[PDB]
């Protein structure tokens, strides 16, 4: 199960807002991509955008943990 | 040095672009804040914004590692 530890190299997908912000993160924690929907790229509401990015990171982290709870 | 392991609760600051995107992350990896400068909230260049967020996450991760290399 040092074999299981090398799910550090799994890519996990997180999202907030139903895909308004999507992120790709390695099991290691390394963030490899961020994809932002044009709807939330609005300079009159940066706050919402920021919250969705944090939310999508949280989603991914909780995914990593769910896939890790597999041995 | 299980005492040192509880630098999991340190807050570390990362940035890209000279502050265009700033992030706050716990030593644990948990992202707690993201702050985006209005200049890069431009729907004609989402790509740049995305790259800065990844860049700021990378910065923070490298900070966590630098502070961890302290015992």
DSSP A4-69: HHTTTT-EEEEEETTTTEEEEEETTS-EEEEEE-GGG--TT-HHHHHHHHHHHHHHHHHHHHHHHS
Which residues from chain B sit within 8 angstroms of residue A35, using beta carbons? 50
Report d(CA A63, CA A41) in Å as an integer.
Answer: 25
How was this one solved?
Answer: X-ray
Phi–psi pair at A18, nearest 5 degrees: 65, 30
- Find the angle CA(B68)-CA(B32)-CA(A50) to the nearest 5 degrees: 135
Q: Closest CB to B49: pick one of A29, A33, A36.
A: A36
User: Which run of H or of E encompasses B57?
Assistant: helix B46-68
Annotated resolution, angstroms: 1.9
Region of residue B31 (left: phi > 0; alpha: psi -120 to 50; beta: else): beta
User: Given an 8 Å threshold on Cβ–Cβ distance, is B38 in contact with A46?
Assistant: yes
User: Given an 8 Å threshold on Cβ–Cβ distance, is A32 in contact with B49?
Assistant: no
Which residues from chain B sit within 8 angstroms of residue A49, using beta carbons? 36, 41
Residue B5: both structure tokens together: 């392991």
Residue B60 carries which DSSP code?
Answer: H
Q: How many CA atoms does the CB half-sphere of B61 hold within 13 Å? A: 14
- Find the angle CA(B59)-CA(B22)-CA(B6) to the nearest 5 degrees: 60
Neighbour count for residue A19 (Cβ, 10 Å) = 10
Which class would CATH give A1-71? alpha beta
* B24 reaches A (C-beta below 8 A): no
């Amino acid at each position: 199960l040092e074999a299981q530890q090398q799910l550090a190299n799994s890519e996990v997908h997180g999202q907030a807002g139903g895909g308004l912000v999507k992120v790709v993160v390695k099991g290691s924690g390394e963030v490899i991509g961020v994809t932002i929907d044009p709807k939330v790229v609005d300079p009159d509401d940066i706050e919402t955008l920021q919250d969705l990015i944090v939310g999508a990171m949280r989603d991914a982290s909780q995914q990593v943990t769910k896939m890790a709870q597999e041995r």
